[PDB]
Design an enzyme around this catalytic site. Structure first.
Site, short mmCIF file in Angstrom:
data_model
loop_
_atom_site.label_atom_id
_atom_site.label_comp_id
_atom_site.label_asym_id
_atom_site.label_seq_id
_atom_site.Cartn_x
_atom_site.Cartn_y
_atom_site.Cartn_z
N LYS A 160 -8.70 15.34 -13.30
CA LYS A 160 -9.90 14.49 -13.24
C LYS A 160 -10.78 14.86 -14.42
CE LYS A 160 -11.59 13.25 -9.28
NZ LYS A 160 -12.26 13.28 -7.96
N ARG A 198 -8.03 3.39 -4.16
CA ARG A 198 -9.15 4.35 -3.96
C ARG A 198 -9.70 4.81 -5.31
NH1 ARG A 198 -9.93 6.88 1.27
NH2 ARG A 198 -10.87 8.55 0.02
N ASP A 210 -7.94 -10.68 -5.81
CA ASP A 210 -8.48 -9.33 -6.09
C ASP A 210 -7.99 -8.86 -7.46
OD1 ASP A 210 -9.93 -8.82 -3.74
OD2 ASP A 210 -8.26 -7.74 -2.79
N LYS A 214 -0.18 -5.74 -5.62
CA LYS A 214 -0.51 -7.14 -5.27
C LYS A 214 0.04 -8.09 -6.33
CE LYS A 214 -4.84 -5.75 -2.96
NZ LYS A 214 -6.29 -6.03 -2.91
N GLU A 266 0.87 -1.19 0.00
CA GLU A 266 0.00 0.00 0.00
C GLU A 266 0.90 1.23 0.00
OE1 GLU A 266 -2.72 -1.23 -0.51
OE2 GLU A 266 -3.15 -2.90 0.91
N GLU A 289 3.18 -5.68 3.27
CA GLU A 289 3.84 -6.97 3.51
C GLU A 289 4.47 -7.47 2.22
OE1 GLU A 289 0.24 -6.89 3.96
OE2 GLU A 289 0.62 -5.75 5.81
N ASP A 303 -4.76 16.92 -1.60
CA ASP A 303 -5.66 15.81 -1.23
C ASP A 303 -4.78 14.59 -0.95
OD1 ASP A 303 -8.10 14.31 -1.01
OD2 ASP A 303 -7.93 13.74 -3.13
N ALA A 304 -4.92 14.00 0.23
CA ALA A 304 -4.20 12.75 0.55
C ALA A 304 -4.65 11.65 -0.40
CB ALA A 304 -4.44 12.35 1.97
N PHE A 338 -7.14 25.83 -9.41
CA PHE A 338 -6.56 24.50 -9.08
C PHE A 338 -5.04 24.61 -9.22
CE2 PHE A 338 -7.40 19.73 -10.40
CZ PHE A 338 -6.58 19.26 -9.41
C1 LIG Z 1 -11.58 17.95 -4.52
S1 LIG Z 1 -10.20 17.06 -3.82
C2 LIG Z 1 -10.33 15.53 -4.75
C3 LIG Z 1 -9.54 15.55 -6.03
O1 LIG Z 1 -9.99 16.66 -6.85
C4 LIG Z 1 -8.87 17.29 -7.44
N1 LIG Z 1 -8.72 18.65 -6.92
C5 LIG Z 1 -7.87 19.11 -5.94
N2 LIG Z 1 -7.92 20.41 -5.78
C6 LIG Z 1 -8.84 20.83 -6.72
C7 LIG Z 1 -9.30 22.11 -7.08
N3 LIG Z 1 -8.87 23.24 -6.51
N4 LIG Z 1 -10.19 22.19 -8.10
C8 LIG Z 1 -10.59 21.05 -8.69
N5 LIG Z 1 -10.24 19.80 -8.42
C9 LIG Z 1 -9.33 19.76 -7.43
C10 LIG Z 1 -7.67 16.39 -7.20
O2 LIG Z 1 -7.58 15.44 -8.23
C11 LIG Z 1 -8.04 15.76 -5.86
O3 LIG Z 1 -7.39 14.51 -5.65
#
Ligand SMILES: CSC[C@H]1O[C@@H](n2cnc3c(N)ncnc32)[C@H](O)[C@@H]1O
Ligand SMILES: [C]OC1=[C][C]=C(C2=N([O])C([C])=[C]C3=C2C2=[C]C(O[C])=[C][C]=C2O3)[C]=[C]1
Ligand SMILES: [C]OC1=[C][C]=C(C2=N([O])C([C])=[C]C3=C2C2=[C]C(O[C])=[C][C]=C2O3)[C]=[C]1
Ligand SMILES: CSC[C@H]1O[C@@H](n2cnc3c(N)ncnc32)[C@H](O)[C@@H]1O
Ligand SMILES: [Cl-]
Ligand SMILES: [Cl-]
Ligand SMILES: [Cl-]
Ligand SMILES: [Cl-]
Ligand SMILES: [Cl-]
Ligand SMILES: [Cl-]
Lengths: 381, 381
Positions: free
Chosen positions: A167, A250, A277, A271, A43, A56, A244-245, A236
């Site tokens: 994203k 995930r 999985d 893995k 992980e 592990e 964002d952690a 952004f």
């Molecule tokens: C909203 S936090 C979840 C994910 O959205 C994206 N994100 C982070 N910050 C921003 C932002 N300011 N505007 C848009 N998406 C974001 C990143 O990919 C993050 O892992």
């Protein structure tokens, strides 16, 4: 009438959860390069300035975790504090121990390879749809390709304000045909991508429409009613693990079918093949794609399940959505006659000791690059 | 003929991924007790001797993370080095920062609460099935109840060799009736549970059949052909985070529908209501259960999707599996007339500033305890 909307998302290589998947699989590959029988359950956690490896590993390999982790982050493109993360100067922390001897004795120790037990219990699905040549939902294919295009234009210096974290999300209007699905039009596109402090919002929105969407989505799917949410947060600059952690496993729906089909919950990255999985999910995709490419159905869902320490699946189920002339019972007999879904046989059929896993850990595990699970089996019946 | 197998799994409170979900939600609750508007994105990582909190919290609350984490681990039952983990003596590490100001400005700053943007993009599903009174798949209900029974018999000292880490898996044979599903029999049960060094395998297998399975699964579903895989690994003394690294949001199918319906990929635990991964998934369950309990359908799947910074869903889709006389278009009009799926309205309807989240983080978020999303809305149409 008879139309519906369906949405899928994807993320880029610098999305913090995806960073973790890629590092976990870089670690797996580093072990497999030296020890094809490495037992790996790695992980990764990512936050501002930190990659932590937890899990592990039992392996004969001598792995430089500092080098493997930092080279993966370098590949992704986090190479300067201005971008929020730097492979050269981040913290790499390791909390790795041997595989539990209780697991080892119950799964693989003193077992014939073909008769190794499943490395855990669980359920896994395979899915295939004839709506694209790659037998994947168009929603997820387009979402992945939009992230790949962002990475391409970042790496070639076309859009040098781009950063690695992105994203995307695609909503398609579908019609149904006797259980098969036919994509009609793109209803909505979302793109969010990390950027530098110099570029203004209008320049980014114009570039995302003209140089990203238009370069990926066929014009036949786009019209004057298509909705665009481009940089909808408005800013952004902070991104990657600083924003964002991230954690390994995930993005399991991005990794698979984008909400289509079904998911049993298991993550893939970090893995080895004894973890069903991954191996059984790959095999289930292989079965599903074999049924569709073999002309037995247009669309199909496969479920399998396992118990830790037991080689053979506990259950196998086939749903063809009404898209086969054959009964789901007849398809199950064809699958049982053509496939052996023990993990110690899947490993041979899909070559799962080969260190190709980092390549799987962004842009989906399915529908690309003719990986062994994407090459249909010729079915005898 | 017309029958199929379907498998779901569940895990116990001491399963390391579930430990992380419960700690993440204990942290969320601790913040909400003092600051109902806390912005919380708390990931937890668990490995031998370690709880790490990683993520982003902006809150007026004064939270003692050492106390909150250790009290959650105490509740789970890890209270001695003999069990592999001890709340009194484990390491609690904190890597928590403020929420990204870029996210805050794009989502909620200077927004009217009803008009807050979604805290992220994403897709979410709701599902309901009339096969049980609680409108959940029997496979997942039985799997959860088997883990709850193990915890009960551990806590009451009936089976004092039990430890907190467990997994269960239930395969049911179903028939279909015009898109509805009817459970016929239990085909296979798996139970794996961590145990002490004193108890022998035969004593455990006998107790798991007689005091766990027989106390949970109605005899009408069990027959001489039912397959039992009880402690199939043969030995499970090492367990909890020592046996397997845990992370928040790695049991998202256990948390929801056990493979039934669909999943959009978002984890629930450690997130306040502005994260639509949780609030919109709860609302989608509420819609689905309202449609089934309202007599509009026997079985239903709801999809919604969002863009970061945008209040209203980008898409809403309803699939009734052929179990309604109403068109999916008519059901969508009923949903639009009865529900407002903006996160800043969902929070009011489902009371999502209330610190009840740790209670959601084991045994599934759906189908129990009359949480607000489990109380059907009376529909006007
Ligand atoms: C909203 S936090 C979840 C994910 O959205 C994206 N994100 C982070 N910050 C921003 C932002 N300011 N505007 C848009 N998406 C974001 C990143 O990919 C993050 O892992
Ligand atoms: C998971 O995944 C999915 C499932 C299912 C589906 C479908 N199918 O198949 C058919 C044939 C038809 C239909 C559908 C739908 C859905 C919706 O939403 C969700 C709406 C409507 C509709 O219709 C898809 C997907
Ligand atoms: C996700 O989730 C699911 C889906 C679908 C289903 C179904 N439906 O609905 C109907 C009506 C019928 C059928 C089905 C099935 C499945 C299988 O496997 C998977 C097999 C067979 C069958 O049949 C379920 C579940
Ligand atoms: C196989 S490791 C994945 C999960 O299986 C369970 N597990 C751990 N060790 C064992 C074991 N020896 N036998 C059976 N299940 C185990 C724990 O819940 C763990 O999180
Ligand atoms: Cl690399
Ligand atoms: Cl195609
Ligand atoms: Cl075979
Ligand atoms: Cl607690
Ligand atoms: Cl019931
Ligand atoms: Cl309303």
């Amino acid at each position: 009438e008879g139309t519906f909307l369906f949405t899928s998302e994807s993320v880029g290589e610098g999305h913090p959860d995806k960073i973790c998947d890629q590092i976990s699989d870089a670690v797996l590959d580093a072990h497999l390069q030296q020890d094809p029988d490495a037992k790996v359950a790695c992980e990764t956690v990512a936050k501002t300035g930190m990659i932590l490896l937890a899990g592990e590993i039992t392996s004969r390999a001598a792995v430089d975790y500092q080098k493997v982790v930092r080279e993966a982050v370098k590949h992704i493109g986090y190479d300067d504090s201005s971008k929020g993360f730097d492979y050269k100067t981040c913290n790499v922390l390791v909390a790795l121990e041997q595989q539990s001897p209780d697991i080892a004795q119950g799964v693989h120790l003193d077992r014939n390879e073909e008769d190794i037990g499943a490395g855990d219990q669980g359920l896994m699905f395979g899915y295939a749809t004839d709506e694209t040549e790659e037998c994947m939902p168009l929603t997820i294919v387009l979402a992945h390709k939009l992230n790949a295009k962002l990475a391409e234009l970042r790496r070639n210096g076309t859009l040098p304000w781009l950063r690695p974290d992105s994203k995307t999300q695609v909503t398609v209007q579908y019609m149904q045909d006797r259980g098969a699905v036919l994509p009609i039009r793109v209803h909505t596109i979302v793109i969010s991508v990390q950027h530098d402090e110099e570029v203004c919002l209008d320049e980014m929105r114009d570039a995302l429409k003209e140089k990203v969407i238009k370069a990926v989505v066929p014009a036949k799917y786009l019209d004057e009613d298509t909705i665009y949410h481009l940089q909808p947060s408005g800013r952004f600059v902070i991104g990657g693990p600083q924003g964002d952690a991230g954690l390994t496993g995930r993005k399991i729906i991005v990794d698979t079918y984008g909400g289509w089909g079904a998911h049993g919950g298991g993550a893939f990255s970090g893995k080895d093949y004894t973890k069903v999985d991954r191996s059984a999910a790959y095999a289930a995709r292989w079965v599903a794609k074999s049924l569709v490419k073999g002309g037995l159905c247009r669309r199909v869902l496969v479920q399998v399940s396992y118990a830790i320490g037991v080689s053979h699946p506990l259950s196998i189920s086939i749903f063809h959505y009404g898209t086969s002339q054959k009964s789901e019972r007849e398809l199950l007999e064809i699958v049982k006659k053509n496939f052996d879904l023990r993990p110690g046989v899947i490993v041979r059929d899909l070559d799962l000791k080969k260190p190709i896993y980092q390549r799987t850990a962004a842009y989906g595990h399915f529908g690309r690059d003719s990986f062994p699970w994407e090459v249909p089996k010729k079915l005898k019946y």
